[PDB]
Design a protein around this ligand. Structure first.
Ligand SMILES: CCCCCC/C=C/CCCCCCCCCC(=O)O[C@@H](CO)COC(=O)CCCCCCCCCCCCCCC
Ligand SMILES: CCCCCC/C=C/CCCCCCCCCC(=O)O[C@@H](CO)COC(=O)CCCCCCCCCCCCCCC
Ligand SMILES: CCCCCC/C=C/CCCCCCCCCC(=O)O[C@@H](CO)COC(=O)CCCCCCCCCCCCCCC
Ligand SMILES: CCCCCC/C=C/CCCCCCCCCC(=O)O[C@@H](CO)COC(=O)CCCCCCCCCCCCCCC
Ligand SMILES: CCCCCC/C=C/CCCCCCCCCC(=O)O[C@@H](CO)COC(=O)CCCCCCCCCCCCCCC
Ligand SMILES: CCCCCC/C=C/CCCCCCCCCC(=O)O[C@@H](CO)COC(=O)CCCCCCCCCCCCCCC
Lengths: 264, 264, 264, 264, 264, 264
């Protein structure tokens, strides 16, 4: 039966923080490849050529992200099996950001011309790249806490977080609340549109990020519900550290909600 | 039971040749977006920067792609249900080549500098684009029958044909011939490697083309074997013209082989 | 059984004033779009071009509302289930006014020429409008407490209030008092007629206001009497907080009468 | 049983065409009210201010209308009860277009500044109005065959036809073809979008013309399926000549399709 | 039962000469790499530095091969299952020489200093090399019919032929003639010794040639005697055309003797 | 039963270390044969001619060696039968490294031109050879602790250690951990690739050193599992001191893991 294991969530959180630090360092290394990356003319896109740049459109994506994060925290506060829920967010965020690192290492696709005045650059040493990596790490990558000074490459990260939070909010609420689901979907779509309308990413980056996050979520939940980690040697599931986390969870996690405080 | 429907196969062959003629016209519309597309420096890649250009490598991809065609043509000749096999090859080469027109329209990603001397260009009219679209159509896009004069955009097409023929040969041969299966997998991988060694496609062009054809092949044969087109209203299968072709085929197609000629 | 919920009515009451304040906030924003609002000549109307403008007709409509309010208040005073009746008035007046904001925001149609001497306007700030909205909110809209100095837009609220009160008066009275209903009906028609004769709204401003309140009033009661909110997935009700308020009420509310005080 | 009364269908077709003549004539009458109707600035809108005017947008609205009429003719030919589907169409179009005559006559609302170059005007006589109305009558109000040269009024007729032919293709096809049903929505939404983008009608005339036809279609079919016209004294149905047309039809018409011609 | 297949042996015989010709084609290509091939001093060898070069030692090895061939040919003449014995020789000599080409192609190691006066070389063409191959192929490699004029590379074929013939001589004789087997072993060891004493190959050239032929000979017979080619998925045999040739032979071939002619 | 004879393991560990001293001494003897060994041009290879020399490649070979040794020490500590796994490792390394002494002594094969700057040479005496050999003995032949300054000979020792420690991690872990098994292949393959890319050993010394250890490992464990040493007079097993070491072990050793220390 569902066993609250509080010593595995710590491991998952540590794994995700390590993954985020690795992603920041890889981003700095990749940015070190090409010096200018801001002199070319952009590729002919279908949405970046029609809709002109909206200067304030990039903060609205993070506003939507914070709203979704607050809703998800509220959901997590009033649940029975909150440990399993917190252990499933991390094991998926780490994997998707590892895929982002792999995609960004092979080929670097930026947008030629926004953030053209970003300072710093030419970080030639081993101990000066680490300070920039630390800033990007403990700045959360957001544009509000100013870290996002230069541009960003393939496999956008805001879309991943938005889609993951939307899918988790929709999944772990009772199947009778079909207005919060619509609100979350609207927030996700508006965030994606505002990522596209700020001229920060190409259309294909957003599309592949959305598809990859959705497919990985659905596949992970299908494997977890089918309970194939102990059924047989099905396919040797390639999710990093999968059977270590879901071994004690058999079947499907129900949707029981309580109040944790002992003060009515 | 398996009914040989020789008139549904003809409808499938016509469906492909319309799709192949639609893609050839899009590739001329897209080429008119940006005139130069040959002055920029290329994106920083991990394979295009290490391995230098091999001038003869792009011709060996099609040589590897004709051996797999001849081998498959022999399978299509000594089979009982060759009508269904030819109807499944066409129903998939159209769906995948339709996805190529979608991703080549939203954003156009070419390689800045090969085929820099290709003539023609500035096809400003409605009746001169069609003539250029006819040359590509009745040349199969190959570099031997000289049509491939200028560059090519996202979602490479050589990787789609190589991977589709490799999976059909493996699928429709007895599960005891695991040397022809290994030989076909070698021609697939060597053909893919020579696209990158000729500096014709980016390292991410070839990975999403390989992934999509592999994923769509396994998804088609899951539905075709589970037989979900009449089981229930599962998901309203989005494959273009799926239930029209597989309605008369129930279950799985066996692997019986014969000789069609009546002259022993 | 019919359990009077004295804590849900308080939540219901809070809902309607927030919408009342929110509507007032939108009204000042709409007035900011075009400054003049007093140069266009009246559009050709088959009703306004016949009846001359009457300065005292507008005050007569507000008089009728008070009389109808007194009749309804007396009914609420001598009813067994006075808690439920008050909860339905707030759950239906808060929905209609939500539609008023959407109609007024998408397009703005006022009366071109009346109240041309109204003062105020040109509020260039983000704090003065809040005080102006407070004046709009804490004046209840009547001209007796002069707040509505300038013109008004589409889907007038005088018709919403006059019609909504009339239906509750007729609905929650026994089917043997068919003399008060005639008095209530003539008052509603007289009040609506005075609005049109006062040149305060267009003819189509009233008709779509008369239809929407009646359609929503009857749709609310049909669902409540059928109690389909829990029977099955009837229609995926889009009424704001419908199942929450009416979960404890089953069947149809009777028309029993008593005396509220304990001193007969 | 379902007996095709061809003498009743003819009376239905002539009934709707008289309404078309009545609608065209009253359009000239309301035009004669305000002479200029091209000097005012447009009212503030939320969609007519952001999206700029597209000269060719209004042509695509009628292109989608022709396709939706071409599929409907295909459905009309192959349906066994082709004498019933046509009779219901004539009995619904006449009612909706009669409501359009009422709203145009009660009040006038147009776009002040488009189609300012249309000639003619000041048709002050008894007989010249008929000639101008006849030109509109035998032009279908289409712009491809240029008749509609001046502006248009409230309750846009392009929205009704685009929607009425969208809810008959969906309704009168088997409930397993939900791709043509999906396709006919794109033909409707894009036809709705393009008339707004061409600055032909306000953002509220389009919405209340999409709602009325959707409401007046579902209400009609609910009455017919439950045969409430003869079951009892249900509601004194207000559809003009409803019990006369649908007296020989009992129950719901099936979805049986047959080929009428005798040349297999 | 043991069915002599007179048509499979013909297919088996064709296989070995094609490999013999293919090996000869590779030999001339390897000689093209280094032009001199006769300048390096011999590497330090514990066997070559002791035994002086003997000009007539090389001719003695070819003499021993003919004597061993005569003994084997006589056995093949007076055996019941002479078809199977001849089929196995061609199926084992065509596999070892395939490994010879791979070893010789990857690296080229010859004797640095012998046959320094050999003519030919510098064949700059693509047709003259083929005519040289026929000289190599149609001379069977012996020095009696002088073809092997220059040196030879790693994995000498003299050891392969001498060792392969010896094992068949011992294997297919009854276990009571343990005097011919001793004579056969003396011829094999004497022939191998003459190769080393002739300064025609290195010491490691012979050892890895002696091991591979013996290992493959015993591995072939163990699989055939165990008849695991059809018993189960034993080891996924990588022998070229192993199951095809030995499908009709079950168990172990006996050692019955007869007379071939019909005239005793 | 499995009785850990700690007096037998010590005799195994001392036996392998004497072979290490023997191997180091004979390397000096063969080095004294040819003085120059740095003047000849390299033999024609297929991998040493395409890939240019990478100066830092040979360092990564030893880095992978330490990691494979670090994981093995982890396995050697948590295994219940840690006294058996170590004994088999010592009894296999001595046999393989004894074959290396035989092939190095019979013939000499090195890369002519690498490590041409190594000093020393001409160690002509009886006692100085021991001092030079002792330096190689207490340096593990590693280049990180620079002892191996001159060239290396046939049967590369870096291939044996990289492969022997790859087939013990795979063998002596439960048959459900096939990701560390997968990981240890990448460590082996890259260690194999880097020694070739550094121009340290020919392309045939690497292949016949990967084959011998793989063959001599599987053959040993097949003999031990079937206890053929005492079952009968099977083959007169040629492993040096085989029946002595594996006489107290019956059957196959299980995969039970336990913590030896008494501090839970
Ligand atoms: C214990 C871990 C739980 C995981 C929770 C998942 C939520 C994601 C949070 C942060 C992701 C940032 C990635 C760090 C590594 C940078 C990678 C990079 O350098 O790549 C960045 C692209 O430049 C990616 O940046 C982003 O991912 C932006 C996402 C921000 C969306 C809003 C998140 C704000 C949360 C605040 C919560 C407050 C609660 C309510 C407030 C009222
Ligand atoms: C009836 C149809 C059956 C379908 C069979 C599928 C085989 C694919 C064949 C051709 C695909 C070409 C695409 C046409 C539209 C151009 C799109 C474009 O313009 O895009 C092109 C990219 O520039 C795509 O080009 C390609 O697809 C190259 C693939 C060629 C690989 C070799 C095929 C040669 C077959 C010859 C058979 C001979 C038999 C043995 C010979 C000894
Ligand atoms: C416990 C809660 C019960 C709720 C009762 C609701 C009754 C509606 C009353 C007033 C509606 C005002 C809406 C506030 C926001 C306006 C938005 C706007 O600013 O829009 C205005 C449009 O001009 C709406 O104006 C109106 O509300 C016109 C309605 C006037 C009808 C007469 C109302 C007089 C009631 C007085 C009762 C006194 C009792 C007897 C006196 C002796
Ligand atoms: C055979 C039965 C088919 C049923 C189709 C019925 C649809 C009615 C069409 C047009 C009504 C026009 C009314 C005239 C006066 C309107 C007053 C006005 O002036 O109002 C106009 C706008 O204010 C109304 O304009 C329109 O009606 C726009 C609708 C155009 C959409 C395509 C209509 C083409 C119908 C042709 C039928 C032939 C079939 C060939 C198939 C390709
Ligand atoms: C169909 C089966 C018949 C049985 C006979 C099998 C004996 C094989 C003979 C020769 C194999 C030569 C391989 C051809 C391609 C060489 C590749 C290369 O080009 O490589 C050569 C490198 O030197 C290999 O040369 C050799 O084959 C040396 C082997 C010589 C051993 C003596 C062979 C003499 C046989 C004469 C038989 C005559 C019968 C009695 C005479 C009175
Ligand atoms: C109980 C744990 C077992 C560990 C297995 C160690 C295997 C021996 C490694 C190397 C043997 C070197 C022999 C010296 C003379 C070779 C002749 C020559 O000079 O030949 C050299 C090349 O020709 C051989 O070089 C090598 O041996 C390459 C192997 C390097 C890979 C890393 C090995 C280092 C592991 C040390 C960790 C030990 C931890 C404490 C121990 C208690």
């Amino acid at each position: 039966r569902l066993d609250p294991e509080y010593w595995k969530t710590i491991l998952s959180c540590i794994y995700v923080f390590i993954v985020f630090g690795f992603t920041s360092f890889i981003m700095v290394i990749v940015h070190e490849r090409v010096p200018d990356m801001q002199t070319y003319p952009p590729l002919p896109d279908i949405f970046l050529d029609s809709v002109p740049r909206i200067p304030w459109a990039f903060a609205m994506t993070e506003v939507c992200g914070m709203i979704l994060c607050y809703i998800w925290l509220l959901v997590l506060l009033l649940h029975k099996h909150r440990s399993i829920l917190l252990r499933r967010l991390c094991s998926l965020m780490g994997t998707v950001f590892l895929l982002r690192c792999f995609t960004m290492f092979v080929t670097s696709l930026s947008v030629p011309g926004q953030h053209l005045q970003c300072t710093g650059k030419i970080y030639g040493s081993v101990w000066e790249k680490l300070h920039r990596a630390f800033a990007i790490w403990s700045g959360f990558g957001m544009t509000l806490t100013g870290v996002h000074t230069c541009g960003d490459y393939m496999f956008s990260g805001h879309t991943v977080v938005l889609t993951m939070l939307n899918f988790f909010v929709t999944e772990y609420t009772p199947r009778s609340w079909n207005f919060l689901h619509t609100l979350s979907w609207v927030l996700n779509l508006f965030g994606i549109f505002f990522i596209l309308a700020a001229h920060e990413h190409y259309s294909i980056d957003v599309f592949i990020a959305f598809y990859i996050t959705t497919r990985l979520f659905l596949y992970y939940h299908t494997l977890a519900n089918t309970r194939a980690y102990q059924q047989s040697r099905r396919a040797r599931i390639w999710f990093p550290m999968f059977s270590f986390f879901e071994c004690n969870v058999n079947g499907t996690v129900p949707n029981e909600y309580c109040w944790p405080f002992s003060k009515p």
